[PDB]
């Protein structure tokens, strides 16, 4: 009947899972910063040449 008395365990698990999801979001965001920027910087040094020099 939506009473916390017995749900305590499931509610605690829900809170822990939400905290874990937030922490994983933060860790992924920080870890994300080969990236497209670096790869394009590398490519620009060796441009494709479809013409003649």
């Amino acid at each position: 009947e939506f009473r916390d008395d017995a749900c305590r365990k499931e509610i605690q698990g829900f809170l822990d899972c939400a905290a874990r999801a937030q922490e994983a979001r933060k860790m992924r965001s920080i870890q994300e910063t080969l990236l497209p920027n670096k790869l394009n910087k590398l490519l620009q040094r060796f441009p494709n040449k479809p013409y003649l020099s």
Binding site: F46, N48, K49, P50, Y51, L52, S53
Partner: peptide, 11 residues
Amino acid sequence: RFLGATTDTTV
């Protein structure tokens, strides 16, 4: 040589 390249790219 790479797709569309006229001359070989060398490193």
